[PDB]
Design an enzyme around this catalytic site. Structure first.
Site, PDB file in Angstrom:
ATOM      1  CG  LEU A 186       1.817  -4.069 -12.650  1.00 59.37           C
ATOM      2  CD1 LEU A 186       1.548  -2.939 -13.573  1.00 59.37           C
ATOM      3  CD2 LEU A 186       2.943  -4.803 -13.029  1.00 59.37           C
ATOM      4  N   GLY A 187       1.444  -3.790  -7.785  1.00 59.38           N
ATOM      5  CA  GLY A 187       1.588  -3.337  -6.503  1.00 59.38           C
ATOM      6  C   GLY A 187       0.514  -2.876  -5.804  1.00 59.38           C
ATOM      7  CB  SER A 188      -1.510  -3.215  -3.426  1.00 58.52           C
ATOM      8  OG  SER A 188      -0.963  -4.102  -2.249  1.00 58.52           O
TER       9      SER A 188
ATOM     10  CB  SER B 198      -4.879  -2.631  -5.814  1.00 57.23           C
ATOM     11  OG  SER B 198      -5.139  -3.140  -4.624  1.00 57.23           O
TER      12      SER B 198
ATOM     13  CE  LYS C 214      -2.967   4.917  -7.592  1.00 54.77           C
ATOM     14  NZ  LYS C 214      -2.151   6.062  -7.319  1.00 54.77           N
TER      15      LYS C 214
ATOM     16  CG  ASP D 170       4.579  10.471  -1.661  1.00 53.56           C
ATOM     17  OD1 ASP D 170       5.399  10.504  -0.810  1.00 53.56           O
ATOM     18  OD2 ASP D 170       3.971   9.425  -2.086  1.00 53.56           O
TER      19      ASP D 170
END
Ligand SMILES: COc1cc(Br)cc2cc(C(=O)O)oc12
EC number: 2.7.11.1
Length: 274
Positions: A12-14, A19, A35, A135
């Site tokens: 999905l994303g990194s 990752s 994750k 964040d």
């Protein structure tokens, strides 16, 4: 134990968070996000309420888990020789606030009010559980497109909430407040309110207000879109140079710009197509 428990799908994303893969829990096809975090890249470790060494991320997710859906739930985690693997919930379908804002540009105020409220609720929920996220930003917020509910995600820069000063930070520079930039010191609450001011500017103008340490330190706010005076006032308030001049969450949620918020279901019907 181990992953015949889950069926791995596409990545999905990194990035700085590691990752994240799309997944399905085999024993009931629940969507999950898997994750992977490298041990070398984990500066911040904790210990479970019962014993062992784990990344702070995990401590913090354990503290924020509940029936309340405004913060992502940790479903499980596994250790490996060089990495930790977290199993988190995955709404479906879903899109992060960064992509959504990239697609649609600056959001109508009504939809920004509804999103920002839900963020405010998520953040209050985390302060309550003794966790400071650190964040808060569009990339760390997910929209469940069917129900119109936002989920704060990515506790990888969080810390236990405390009332004394912080002197470390590893979240996102363009969302960090003036006192972190100048002094490397902040208190959690007020640094959170500043990041929320950046966040709200972003939703209603379509981009963050400040790119450079210069503009952060100075905190003059220029609006590039038509934005109402009440919304501009709230934003300039969250972004007061002096921490003690920033509103509390109660004061943000009692702001005139925050009245008459839509329900999440309402929000999806009108703004997301349900
Ligand atoms: C693309 O990254 C992601 C996708 C989904 Br779906 C859920 C999460 C949760 C986190 C996190 O806690 O970092 O990252 C995620």
């Amino acid at each position: 134990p181990l992953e015949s428990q889950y069926q791995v799908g596409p990545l999905l994303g990194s990035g700085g968070f590691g990752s994240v893969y799309s997944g399905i829990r085999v024993s009931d096809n629940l969507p999950v996000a898997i994750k992977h975090v490298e041990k070398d890249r984990i500066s911040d470790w904790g210990e479970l309420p019962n014993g062992t060494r784990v990344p702070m991320e995990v401590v913090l997710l354990k503290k924020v888990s509940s029936g309340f859906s405004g913060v992502i739930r940790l479903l499980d985690w596994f250790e490996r020789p060089d990495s930790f693997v977290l199993i988190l919930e995955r709404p479906e379908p879903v899109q992060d606030l960064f992509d959504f804002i990239t697609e649609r540009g600056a959001l109508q105020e009504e939809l920004a009010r509804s999103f920002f409220w839900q963020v405010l609720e998520a953040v209050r929920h985390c302060h309550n559980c003794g966790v400071l996220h650190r964040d808060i930003k569009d990339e760390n917020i997910l929209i469940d497109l069917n129900r119109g509910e936002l989920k704060l995600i990515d506790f990888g820069s969080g810390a236990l909430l405390k009332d004394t000063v912080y002197t470390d930070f590893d979240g996102t520079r363009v969302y960090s407040p003036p006192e972190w930039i100048r002094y490397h010191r902040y208190h959690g609450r007020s640094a959170a309110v500043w990041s929320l001011g950046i966040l709200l500017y972003d939703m209603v103008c379509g981009d963050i207000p400040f790119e450079h340490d210069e503009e952060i330190i100075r905190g003059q706010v220029f609006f590039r879109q038509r934005v109402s005076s009440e919304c501009q006032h709230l934003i300039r308030w969250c972004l007061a140079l002096r921490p003690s001049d920033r509103p509390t969450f109660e004061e943000i949620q009692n702001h005139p710009w925050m009245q008459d918020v839509l329900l999440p279901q309402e929000t999806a019907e009108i703004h997301l197509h349900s």
